[PDB]
């Protein structure tokens, strides 16, 4: 989980 919140 990646900031603002996307899934890589």
Request: net charge positive.
């Amino acid at each position: 989980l990646d900031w603002p919140x996307r899934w890589k």
